[PDB]
Amino acid sequence: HQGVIKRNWEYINKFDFSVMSYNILSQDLLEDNSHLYRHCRRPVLHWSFRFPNILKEIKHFDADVLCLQEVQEDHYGAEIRPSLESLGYHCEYKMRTGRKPDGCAICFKHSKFSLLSVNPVEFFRPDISLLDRDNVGLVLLLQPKICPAICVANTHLLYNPRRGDIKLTQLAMLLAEISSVAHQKDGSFCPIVMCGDFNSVPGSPLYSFIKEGKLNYEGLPIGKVSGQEQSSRGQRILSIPIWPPNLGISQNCVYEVQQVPSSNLQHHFSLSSVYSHYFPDTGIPEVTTCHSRSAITVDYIFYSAEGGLKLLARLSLLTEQDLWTVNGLPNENNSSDHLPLLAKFRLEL
Ligand SMILES: [K+]
Ligand SMILES: [K+]
Ligand SMILES: [Mg+2]
């Protein structure tokens, strides 16, 4: 019907599992950035209001795997981890480094998987001046309880729109960890699901690199990498190579043995995006976040596809206009400034 604002399930020897990616908005970061939330009714911003709504959403969708971002450490220990464990999830956390209050969590139903390994990633390198930011990632290797393992990755990349050099290097570090964890004895990669808040928009150079496995970055200004709103003036062009040899990551985004003393990046995965980023009838963009200064897609679920996975269904997203009709995010009903992404996958056996 005209004007309806609804999130629908769109349908596109086996193991079926669902994955939810959700940046839940850290209370400390909300309060530190109160200018982004001026549009919100004051009572809806308190953590005592937001957490029950977030937990209710998680319970409603009952996803097999949760990839969460902006999980605040104190709240995680006091309330989020106990609540998720009560719902049947095993939870693994990786907090941002430094003075930062929040991090990434990957949680999975213990009825659906066993844990093979936990592989945190710290993007902060004290020995590499480029990598001075506190962002992190987390990679789990899971064994379906019934068959290959499944590699689940989660990250929250640097927000700063100018620093595409840092963003691409952080992404390369996550991709290198995935390449090591997902490697199988037969030389192929097990199925991969890579979720997170990439702070980069559809069609940006960083997005295209993920989807295509290649990026020619010759002449690319650092602030054009992510496609986020930027001045697009006075910016340094990416170095060739982007990051120094002491990182120990090659231009194919794999770990390499460092030794004593072209402008293309590659990776070896075949990744698709769950969402197509535009509504087919109208061409209007999908958004995953909507506050006073931004309404864009920055959140993704990427997956191995023709260890391929079949996408069975996804929970449809909304437009910027749809979100302002409900007076933006967070609101009295949606308690993050992001929307949760949700997919159902099939592993054929
Ligand atoms: K390995
Ligand atoms: K610059
Ligand atoms: Mg945020």
Bound molecules: potassium ion, magnesium ion
- The overall strand count is 17
Please count the helical segments.
6
- Helical proportion, percent range: 10-25%
Strand order of the largest sheet: 1-16-17-2-3-5-4
Q: From N to C, what is the helix and strand string?
A: EEHHEHEEEEEHEHEEEEEEEHE
The geometry reads as: globular
* Major sheet summary line: 7 strands, mixed
**Class by SSE composition:** alpha+beta
State Rg.
Answer: 19 Å
What proportion of the residues form beta strands (DSSP E)?
25-35%
Terminal Cα span: 40 Å
Total domain count: 1
Organism: Homo sapiens (Human)
Family: Belongs to the CCR4/nocturin family.
Protein name: Protein angel homolog 2
GO molecular function: catalytic activity; mRNA 3'-UTR binding
Description of the structure:
The protein has 349 residues and is of the alpha+beta class. The chain has one domain. It is 19% helix and 30% strand. The protein has 6 helices and 17 strands. It has helices spanning 27-32, 47-61, 73-86, 164-181, 205-212, 320-325, and strands at 9-11, 14-23, 65-72, 89-95, 102-109, 113-122, 136-144, 150-156, 192-197, 214-216, 264-266, 271-273, 289-291, 294-296, 299-304, 310-315, 341-348. The strands form 4 sheets. It has a 7-stranded mixed beta sheet. It has a 6-stranded mixed beta sheet with strand order 6-7-8-9-15-12, with helices on one face. Strands 10-11 form a two-stranded antiparallel ribbon. A hairpin with a 2-residue loop joins strand 13 (289-291) and strand 14 (294-296). The longest helix is centred in the middle third of the chain and has 18 residues, at 164-181. The protein is globular. It starts with 8 loop residues before the first strand and ends with a strand. It binds potassium ion (2 copies) and magnesium ion. One potassium ion is lined by residues 162, 222, 235-236. It is classed as rna binding protein. The entry lists the keywords phosphatase, CCR4d, RNA binding protein. It forms a monomeric assembly.
